[PDB]
Amino acid sequence: GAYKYIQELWRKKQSDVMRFLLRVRCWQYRQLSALHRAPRPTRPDKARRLGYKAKQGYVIYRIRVRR
């Protein structure tokens, strides 16, 4: 299954590949409002673990918290 490859990729956050993705998204997200609907899970994999299924009535809101 693909999900284990997606899992262990997300554990290498200091890797060139994920540093680029975590910076170009963390850019993207700043230019949106602090509380907006994401059309899907940004991490489909992680959401699987936490109990999110891909069926009608499962909603996903990307909300930023000031740090």
Binding site: G1, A2, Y3, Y5, I6, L9, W10, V17, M18, L21, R40, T42, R43, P44, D45
Partner: peptide, 30 residues
């Protein structure tokens, strides 16, 4: 998920990947 399981099984004769996958990590390893 079906494709990756039959790359380890070596059943896949040709894999046709798409370039515009929204979170790239789904496909990066493939």
């Amino acid at each position: 998920n079906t494709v990756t399981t039959l790359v380890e099984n070596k059943k896949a004769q040709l894999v046709v990947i798409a370039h515009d996958v929204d979170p790239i990590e789904l496909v990066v390893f493939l």
